[PDB]
Amino acid sequence: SSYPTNDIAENPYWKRDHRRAYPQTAFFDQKTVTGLLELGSEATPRIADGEAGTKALANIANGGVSFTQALGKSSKDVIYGEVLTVNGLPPVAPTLAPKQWKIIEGEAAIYPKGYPCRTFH
């Protein structure tokens, strides 16, 4: 057994219940992304307070703005920060753990120079 998992006196099960803290699957249809484009985000808002914000959320949630009018309306700042990169480039297909390859040559290689099989580390 391992500590602190085996402790008799300080581990409630619900503090280490990782199965029940599973990540929810996030689904985004085009209405949600429309809302993200127009109203901004929880992180960086572009919404007014009071009835204005709730009514804006409602009328995007009903169909008033389409995704394409959403994109055309979008300013340069929005398009560069929040659709493309800050330089205007598209984001690359992301990688969880990037792997930098190196080629081992010489004596530390597996086969000698002639063979058509190289050693990558």
**Distance of alpha carbon 59 from alpha carbon 100, whole angstroms:** 48
Give the nearest distance from C-beta 88 to other proteins in angstroms: 12
**Distance of alpha carbon 59 from alpha carbon 55, whole angstroms:** 6
Please pick, from the candidates 9, 50, 75, 86, the single residue that binds other proteins as defined by CB under 8 A.
9
Q: Phi, psi at residue 104, to the nearest 5°?
A: -95, 125
> Which residue number, 52 or 64, has a Cβ lying nearer to other proteins?
64
Q: Phi, psi at residue 32, to the nearest 5°?
A: -65, -45
- Binding of other proteins at residue 94 (CB under 8 A)? yes
- Binding of other proteins at residue 95 (CB under 8 A)? yes
- Binding of other proteins at residue 2 (CB under 8 A)? yes
- Binding of other proteins at residue 113 (CB under 8 A)? no
Cα angle vertex 32, ends 34, 53, to 5°?
A: 75
Residue 65 structure tokens:
């703005």
> Which residue number, 52 or 104, has a Cβ lying nearer to other proteins?
104
Please pick, from the candidates 44, 63, 106, 120, the single residue that binds other proteins as defined by CB under 8 A.
120
**Angle of the 30-39 helix axis to the 50-62 helix axis, nearest 10:** 150
Contact residues for other proteins, defined by CB under 8 A? 1-2, 5-10, 12-14, 16-19, 21-23, 25-30, 33, 36, 67-68, 71, 82-84, 90-96, 98-99, 104, 110-111, 115-121
